[PDB]
Amino acid sequence: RYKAEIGSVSPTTSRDTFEDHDTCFLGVSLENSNFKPAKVDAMAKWISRRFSQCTVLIGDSIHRITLESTRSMPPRAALDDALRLGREFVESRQPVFESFRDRTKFTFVTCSEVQSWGLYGDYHERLRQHYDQDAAFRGSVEAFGRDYGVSAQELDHRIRKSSEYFLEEFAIFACLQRTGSPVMVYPGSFSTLSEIAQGKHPGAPEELRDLIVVSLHLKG
């Protein structure tokens, strides 16, 4: 069993105004231990006290990138697997969320659905361009992927691919931010989003500058 509490809030100034909103989104990563059924229960609970509507964003299509890299899977397997794992999560966890239908309506939306939106194209293109044309923003984004006896040209490749994950995901986050869900809930932080909100990448999309990310901490 677990108890969720505010770990952190970006921007800092939004740490005491975010609860004025009545709608949020919860970003779900797949095959991720922060989304075990019990943890999902504590996060839905914390959400149920603050928010009457919650989009549960399932990171399915973006998970294809993770599976290609870390498990070597070929293009079709990686996407069919990523979508299946998404379906399995919805089917597994959906009772956990319905336990709270008294207080919060949880709607599931997939990353693949939002990627069919024209907005995703607009946002993703602006983000990739700024990645290509701005060293400071590029370095912020690739900071996670620089976790990675492997050649220099190969390692670069894997840093790049891992950073393509974040550009897909940040564009999807901005899509939700601008379409009724200005607060994001996630059990973790995103340094790049944080710096953008604190005004450190002024050429990064405004839409991410207005995003509010509540980083939850899960304890037993």
TrEMBL record:
Pfam families: CDPS (PF16715). Keywords: Transferase. GO terms for molecular function: aminoacyltransferase activity. Signal peptide: none annotated. It comes from the Bacteria. The keyword Cell membrane does not apply. Belongs to the CDPS family. This is Cyclodipeptide synthase. The gene is bcmA.
